[PDB]
């Protein structure tokens, strides 16, 4: 969020308020800055944003701009008074990857403080299937998915995928930590289907002729061995060209109109619909 800064010259107090916030005590606007920092987010803090604005203002009149050595530059005499919405602080982030074998109980543990209480927790899970999205873990079935400590009893190969805690404060401020669960399947289930994402594939002759676009393949169930992929049926050469490397199909447009690519692992097939525009 953008945080405004105001400076009282007589008391030497620099108040940090929200972008919409306001103060009526003699404090003059000295500029604004983004507090979670767009580039270099964990590299700087409010002190650095308040010091870079005050450097651009006159010590004799803080409403006017000045240059060194007639600017505000001794921060030892300046006191920052924070009155902006407080940020949530991850005290303990989630492990980047947890690993287990089928049948064991997994347990995630996030520490989160700061903001305004009460703090609420909502766990979510994204499957490893290509093109999947995160989705709330039912907290009626799993009472722990509404707390800071999640527990997944007796993992399966389907438990594998990204997990994510989203903590919200009473002001609506939010923080999130994520963790990939890897599950060791002793006897991997044999492929039932191949999934293509994106499918359909939308191409533009104007935009995509040089580099094309890519389609990724995944196996169902998750953790099955997809095997070696090959193109069984090429697209119409008057509409598109296609090449496959590993689990990635690259498709390049030739002219407007619809075509299809059939990809196989020798036992299963998937059709990618390709829509080419001008």
């Amino acid at each position: 969020p953008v945080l405004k800064v105001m400076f009282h010259k007589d008391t030497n107090v620099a108040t940090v308020l929200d972008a919409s916030g306001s103060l009526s005590d003699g404090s003059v606007e000295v500029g604004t800055f983004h507090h979670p920092d767009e580039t270099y987010p964990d590299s700087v803090t409010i002190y650095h944003g308040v010091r870079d604005l005050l450097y651009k203002r006159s010590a004799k009149d803080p409403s006017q701009t000045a240059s060194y050595p007639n600017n505000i530059i001794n921060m030892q005499v300046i006191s920052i008074d924070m009155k902006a919405t407080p940020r949530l602080i991850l005290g303990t982030a989630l492990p980047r990857v947890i690993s287990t074998i089928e049948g064991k109980d997994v347990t995630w543990h996030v520490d989160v403080a700061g903001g305004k209480a009460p703090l609420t927790y909502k766990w979510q899970f994204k499957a490893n299937t290509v093109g999947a999205a995160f989705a709330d873990i039912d907290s009626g079935e799993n009472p722990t998915a509404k707390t800071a400590t999640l527990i997944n009893h007796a993992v399966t190969a389907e438990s594998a995928g990204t997990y994510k805690v989203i903590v919200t404060d009473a002001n609506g401020t939010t923080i999130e930590s994520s963790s990939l669960l890897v599950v060791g399947v002793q006897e991997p289930p044999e492929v039932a289907s191949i999934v293509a994402y994106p499918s359909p594939l939308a191409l533009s002759v104007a935009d995509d002729i040089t580099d094309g676009k890519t389609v990724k393949f995944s196996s169902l169930p998750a953790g099955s061995l997809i095997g070696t992929l090959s193109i069984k049926t090429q697209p119409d050469s008057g509409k598109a060209t296609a090449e496959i490397s590993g689990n990635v199909l690259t498709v390049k447009p030739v002219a407007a109109g619809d075509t299809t690519v059939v990809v196989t692992n020798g036992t299963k097939e998937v059709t990618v619909t390709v829509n080419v525009t001008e």
Binding site: V97, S99, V182, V183, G184, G246, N247
Partner: protein, 51 residues
């Protein structure tokens, strides 16, 4: 047979499990490639008067 396979191409080595990978997949040549200073043609032509 334990194979090295191609870790950088998505094929892990046999020794590496589902939650493991090669620590060193390349060698870093620490002698860098640098460009030389540009040539100056007009600075040599200048005679200097002391100030």
């Amino acid at each position: 047979m334990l194979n090295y396979n191609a870790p950088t191409d998505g094929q892990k080595s046999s020794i590496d499990g589902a939650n493991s990978d090669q620590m060193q997949t390349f060698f870093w040549l620490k002698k860098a490639i640098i460009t030389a200073r540009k040539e100056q043609y007009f600075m040599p032509l200048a005679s200097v008067t002391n100030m």
